[PDB]
Amino acid sequence: QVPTRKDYGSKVSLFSHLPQYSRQNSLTQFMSIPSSVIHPAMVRLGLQYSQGLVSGSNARCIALLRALQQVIQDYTTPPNEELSRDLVNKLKPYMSFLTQCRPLSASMHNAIKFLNKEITSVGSSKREEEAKSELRAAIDRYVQEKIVLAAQAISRFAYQKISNGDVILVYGCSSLVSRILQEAWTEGRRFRVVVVDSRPWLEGRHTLRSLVHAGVPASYLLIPAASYVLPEVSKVLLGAHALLANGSVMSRVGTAQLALVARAHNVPVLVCCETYKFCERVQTDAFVSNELDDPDDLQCKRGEHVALANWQNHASLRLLNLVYDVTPPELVDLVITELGMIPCSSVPVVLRVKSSD
Amino acid sequence: QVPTRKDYGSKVSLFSHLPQYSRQNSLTQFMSIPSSVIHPAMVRLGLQYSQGLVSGSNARCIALLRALQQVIQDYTTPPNEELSRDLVNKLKPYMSFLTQCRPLSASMHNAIKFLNKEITSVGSSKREEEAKSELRAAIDRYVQEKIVLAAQAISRFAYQKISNGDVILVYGCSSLVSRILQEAWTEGRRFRVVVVDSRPWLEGRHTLRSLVHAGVPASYLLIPAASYVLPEVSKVLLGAHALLANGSVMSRVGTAQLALVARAHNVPVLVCCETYKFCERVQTDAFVSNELDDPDDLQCKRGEHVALANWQNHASLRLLNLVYDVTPPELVDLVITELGMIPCSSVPVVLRVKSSD
Amino acid sequence: GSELSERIESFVETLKRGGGPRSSEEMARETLGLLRQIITDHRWSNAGELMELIRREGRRMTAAQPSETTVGNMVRRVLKIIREEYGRLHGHYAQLQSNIIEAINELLVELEGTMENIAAQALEHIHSNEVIMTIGFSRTVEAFLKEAARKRKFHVIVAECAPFCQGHEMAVNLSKAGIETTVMTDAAIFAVMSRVNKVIIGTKTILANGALRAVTGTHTLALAAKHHSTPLIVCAPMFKLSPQFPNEEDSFHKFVAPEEVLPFTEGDILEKVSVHCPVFDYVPPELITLFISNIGGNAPSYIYRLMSELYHPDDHVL
């Protein structure tokens, strides 16, 4: 059995229902080295998640699908049992280990749901090996389309929206937005992109490096100074981590703030997302459901005087860095998906259409 | 020494800094019958306030001024002392007794401030009796002008604003608004007034009776149904209890709600107030400074089943009836005073002009 | 035979005079049982004649009490069920009737699960040390809150409804479960709104526009929530959904005796003053943040699709 991770630090009272974990104190130090309770690939992926080596939503989902391929490939059906139920029952401890290492993202949840649906759809009469590699091929097809073909389609749809000589503001790291901008620059568009970043992850440097390598003119500033640069900005492009049933955008913590300030500055806000990241779940705030990263990341290395060094030694001091936030659907204009351009009002409709309804 | 009133009931946590009193448990049951620590007139007025027999702001201020006249009239200067300081020092216990019986209103605060200013302005060389009746005549002049002449001027200014065949919405009991409407009807205006009332005081019946006695066509409904009647209403007329330095209107609890709904319904909101009720104080909410009435008044007599009968026997149950609320200055259009019509933006300017500046 | 007739009558007069049954879930159950007994105890062979008599008796019901829309919209649900069964068997007479009966049976067994479904869904919408505000009385909302309270600590501010102070008994019921509850007059809604996190309220009827017909004073609460940008949640089961639109209808507000607003003992002024006591009021969809139903959360901008999923568009007039 996998032990429970100790919740490091002092949680904010409003977030007492969410877990807070420390990057230093991992979870695999109470597990057998030749792991047997958890599949080797799954413990590998959990350790990679906990340390933060896999960050992007698409990256997390792809790593999850590859680990699941490695799992099912090595899976063998016990006697007097059928794969359909046994495999989906054996996959639950792995999912619990993952969510203990780091809470699952919307892409991961949707991928696991689809995988369980496919496994339960495997025929009772079918043999073992062809069922296994049929599952592998289905995972390959699923990831292939829903990632690369979705990205290409969204890139084309966004290219037919970006005009010449316009300033685009981006926030944080997002593979989809970076690919969109790279393809738009390659196709012939001539624009400049303003990269907005935020502490403590400083993930904006990733898209900044990507843009500079692609040759796109780029500018960089942290999110507090966004109000100063928006007069120049012609458009705001963001990458969603989740799109809920009500049309709200669940993405990085600084997304809703930027959308608000852009609305205040008459700058249309565009969010790029795929259909597999749509979730029937819904929330109205960043408090009901969120993720608390390690509060020790807030500590700034300002030379010789780190102010929040011993923050735990102060009884009335609380630290909190939210990983996600929600933008109300009325602060966002466009959602660019495989189906094309849609309003946030039309997200649940697309959900229905993708529910084979 | 006057003992402190026990704070009845369980206060709401956000209002723990305010006192909550019971109408049944008075304050004069630990005082000498031929009262000596407190002047007979002052204890009389405190008892009248605590029982709720004096409700209106103008009524409270006038009763305070009459009790103060009775006090100074019976005041005698001790030997080797001057009236200027001795009288203002002896008036403080009376003010404390009053504020313990019921928190002082803005009109009362301004009146006491002006009275202390006048007392300190009494000449050292002057004798006793003519100083006393000079104070009496100054109080007479002050109340006379600031009440009746202010009311007449505001009535004329409001009459030149009310048009023919228009629906006016009023809230609660206010001598100034009732007088304005009566004078407007007498002058020749033909209109109808919608009276809005709220639990538990049900003070709207007062202005309703006044209007019906004056012959003005009237309609009555409680504040929850205000959204239903505002489409018909042509204008909202309210009576302020206090006008703060920022222009906010500190008045009965249901005033800000009505102003909000009227703004939502494109109905201009008018507040009638005098200059002596202007206060250099300022607040942004109904929480920093308010008054908590007896929570036992919330209990409704719905026949045979009073639901909140034993509310104190429920540990997690809290009752609260706020006596005041603040309307932000942007939800109000006009303020009609002696100087004429002004925006709420111009309240502190009038304060300066009335500061003999 | 005449049992069916006298039971239909009894139900009509019970709906006309007072509120019976009290809970509108029980009202839905009763009307569905009556519709079943009608479709069983009549000599109908073609589905058209059955639909016609159902529409006639539903018109009589709607005329009995227009403000009670659950009966009418569930009559429309039964009509949609009949249409679906006829399309299945035509796109077969005894099987038709028994299939309609089992359809009504599944509708009824899912009818009693909406309460539990919303109660279960409640947990993922309430966080610790949150300040809820609600107005009036609503069994669904109190179940929501007392189910969220089993694993969370939060405060509920209940605005009593004048004149019918149903909010007092709701506050008492919430305090039973140790849900720290503050009771206030509806006049203090905007004054306290600045310190509220969420607004959770029930409803009597949801219109196709997304707007909802709820107890009087809730429109002011929604306006305050919009002013303070606090999310307003509506926990309404899927049998309060009415395909009618706001102003294509008649008889929206329910006016009761003004004795509730101004008593008879006031005397002579009661001949000069016009008193009005609207029980319900209209809340536009722009002021609702999220709808909570037995299927899950949905934005007001999807209620029309829910209509298309529930009611045939040719039955919106009955």
Topology:
The structure is cut from a larger assembly and holds 2 copies of chain A (357 residues) and 1 copy of chain C (318 residues).
Chain A lengths: L39 H11 L6 H18 L8 H19 L4 H15 L8 H31 L7 E5 L3 H13 L4 E6 L6 H11 L3 E5 L3 H4 L5 E5 L2 E2 L5 E4 L2 H10 L4 E4 L51 E4 L6 E4 L2 E3 L4 H7 L4
Parallel strand pairs in A: 1-2, 1-4, 2-3, 4-7, 7-9
Antiparallel strand pairs in A: 5-6, 6-8, 9-10
Helix pairs in contact in A: 1-2, 1-3, 2-4, 2-5, 3-4, 5-6, 6-7
Chain C lengths: L1 H16 L6 H17 L6 H18 L4 H22 L3 H18 L1 H9 L8 E6 L3 H10 L5 E6 L6 H11 L4 E4 L4 H5 L4 E4 L3 E2 L5 E4 L2 H11 L3 E4 L37 E3 L4 E4 L6 E3 L4 E2 L4 H8 L8
Parallel strand pairs in C: 1-2, 1-4, 2-3, 4-7, 7-10
Antiparallel strand pairs in C: 5-6, 6-9, 10-11
Helix pairs in contact in C: 1-2, 2-4, 2-5, 3-4, 4-5, 6-7
Structure description:
This is part of a larger assembly, with 2 copies of chain A (357 residues) and 1 copy of chain C (318 residues). Chain A is α/β, with parallel strands linked by helices. Chain A starts with 39 loop residues before the first helix and ends with a helix. Chain A folds into 2 domains: 153 residues, no CATH class; 204 residues, no CATH class. In chain A, the strands form 2 sheets. A 7-stranded mixed β-sheet of chain A has the order 3-2-1-4-7-9-10. Chain A has a 3-stranded antiparallel β-sheet with strand order 5-6-8, with helices on one face. In chain A, helix 2 packs parallel to helix 4 and helix 3 runs antiparallel to helix 4. Helices cover 39% and strands 12% of the residues of chain A. Chain A is built from 10 helices and 10 strands. With 318 residues, chain C is an alpha/beta fold. Chain C is 46% helix and 13% strand. Chain C contains 11 helices and 11 strands. In chain C, the strands form 2 sheets. A 7-stranded mixed β-sheet of chain C has the order 3-2-1-4-7-10-11, sandwiched between helices. A 3-stranded antiparallel β-sheet of chain C has the order 5-6-9, with helices on one face. In chain C, strand 1, helix 7 and strand 2 form a beta-alpha-beta unit. In chain C, helix 1 packs antiparallel against helix 2 and helix 6 packs across helix 7. The longest helix of chain C is centred in the N-terminal third of the chain and has 22 residues. The radius of gyration of chain C is 21 Å and the shape is globular. Chains in contact: A-C, B-C. The interface between A and C is medium-sized, with 23 and 22 residues. The PDB classes it as translation. Keywords: Translation, Integrated stress response, translation.
